[PDB]
Amino acid sequence: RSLVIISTLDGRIAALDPENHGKKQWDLDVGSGSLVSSSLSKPEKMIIPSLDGDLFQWDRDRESMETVPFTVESLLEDVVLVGGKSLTTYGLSAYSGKVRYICSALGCRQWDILLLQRTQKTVRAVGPRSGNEKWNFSVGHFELRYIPSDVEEQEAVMMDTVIKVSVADWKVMAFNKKGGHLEWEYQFSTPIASAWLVKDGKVIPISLFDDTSIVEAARGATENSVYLGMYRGQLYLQSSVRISEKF
Amino acid sequence: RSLVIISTLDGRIAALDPENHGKKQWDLDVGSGSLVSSMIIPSLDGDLFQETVPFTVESLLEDVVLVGGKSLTTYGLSAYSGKVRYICSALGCRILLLQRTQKTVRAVGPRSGNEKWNFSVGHFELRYITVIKVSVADWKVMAFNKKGGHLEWEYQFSTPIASAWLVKDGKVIPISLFDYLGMYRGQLYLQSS
Amino acid sequence: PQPWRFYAP
Amino acid sequence: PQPWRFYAP
Structure with a gap:
């Protein structure tokens, strides 16, 4: 039932099934x-x-x-x-x-x-x-x-596994929360900008990470920094988070 | 040589020579x-x-x-x-x-x-x-000869007016507006007058 | 409302 | 220019 909605830079939109190792369901190109x-x-x-x-x-x-x-x-x-x-x-x-x-x-x-x-x-x-x-x-x-002044948060968990996006690999990855080892993954032809997990009505934005590497260490992003990505020779900037993996 | 350009609520543009008594040079429709x-x-x-x-x-x-x-x-x-x-x-x-x-x-x-x-x-x-002014309650362009206040020419538009400018030798002079909420064949709107 | 006079908020 | 990192002035 659940879906993983992901927005790549080619303008297209794809949905993935997080209940079948991230199988691709459909595509959506709005032609814009x-x-x-x-x-x-x-x-x-x-x-x-x-x-x-x-x-x-x-x-x-x-x-x-x-x-x-x-x-x-x-x-x-x-x-x-x-x-x-x-x-x-x-x-x-x-x-x-x-x-x-x-x-x-x-x-x-x-x-x-x-x-x-x-x-x-x-x-x-x-x-x-x-x-x-x-x-x-x-x-x-x-x-x-x-x-x-009040801030919140939320993690993108699903069936004892958590799903994350490596922004430099354009990969949507799912890790079993116990152990942290990788469970399934899907790489896109085009860099990833945004991703959402649709589970039981509620929608979750999946934070995108830049792995500077399970005892996973995510961090914020400085004062006014900007992350650099490339799409077919064209450059852009996004809002990724730092992340290091150790053992 | 100069011209008086007026934008009507029709979405149209008209050019009136302020010399030959507002002689209409051309009218324009953008299709939009x-x-x-x-x-x-x-x-x-x-x-x-x-x-x-x-x-x-x-x-x-x-x-x-x-x-x-x-x-x-x-x-x-x-x-x-x-x-x-x-x-x-x-x-x-x-x-x-x-x-x-x-x-x-x-x-x-x-x-x-x-x-x-x-x-x-x-x-x-x-x-x-002549100092060209505008009567928005009448949808009319009126140029008032500075000598005695008596106007020399005017031009009347069938459609209410949005904005008007004079182009006096290369420069663009915005024509002021005097006697808010308006209406053009149905719908109301607002202006800053 | 009147569509032909200078209204003020 | 550069690769796939953050940067700032």
Whole structure:
């Protein structure tokens, strides 16, 4: 009954069965393209967008990572700047994954419930008099919900095993909590950005880890650091957690 | 040489020469329809009022499920003939510049997916590469000759007005507005006057 | 509400 | 540039 919903960077969405060693159930490509895009003409040294829209700057010659004064959305509030922001929802059957409806800003088509919403923010850079694009930055992310000073937490456990994502391996891994040794795994063709475990209605986001290595040692992430990943020659940043494995 | 550019709630753009008594040079339709589509009443820029709510059109997107998106499209026409030269948007990128921001948001039931309510506001902002005033209660452009206050010419629009600018020799001068809540063949909206 | 006068919150 | 690590200024 349970599902493991995972959002890769190719824009696609897959479901895995955590009750059969992570067998793949179905795929879902909404056709909105990949999650990060960047066209360019002539230097501006390297602009690295994040999935929330925040852009970052790496200077090649001094080999340094800097922030950027504008985020993808701030360009929407030398060049004229076009584009737009988008949030489309996709309603899927809780089990089968058949699309029950897709509702966009454009319209609503129709054919428990898994609710998927894809955010997508694109910004092109157009020459003022020309009308030709000189660069662009398209960026998106997924988010999942189920439809039948204080901080919290939650762990992604299931049948005496816990499930975790290694973000540098793009792998969804399940470990027996007693012993910590690996139980099953699944690797994706495309880096993983977000993952959720759907169990008994409640949905769980699976934190993504970068294994600096069962006596497992997870840690936070500094002051204002950013984790670096690559999708088919395109770079981006996420929110992974540190993790070391010992014996 | 200068021109008076006015954005109507039809979603249209008109060019009137403020010299030859508001002589209409050309009119334009973007195909995207009226500046607003639909108690809750919005501003053309996205603000929301009922009297104020702590939300904007985008503050809601971030009982029901919301969908919607803001679009920034720039149209490029000939400055005085008005015939199109380039159009740029997220679609693609096929001298005065017309940047339309159409803010739509749809409330949708989580299980069915059919529309509940929706608001789709729009707003124009312009760029270019006698003191003219505006009567919004009458949908009229009025240029008042500074000598004696007596006007020289006026132009009347059948559709209520959203914004107006004068382009006095390259510069873009926003035309002020004088005698809030409006209405264009049905739906109410808000402006900052 | 009246659609033709300067309203104030 | 670099590989698959965190970084900062």
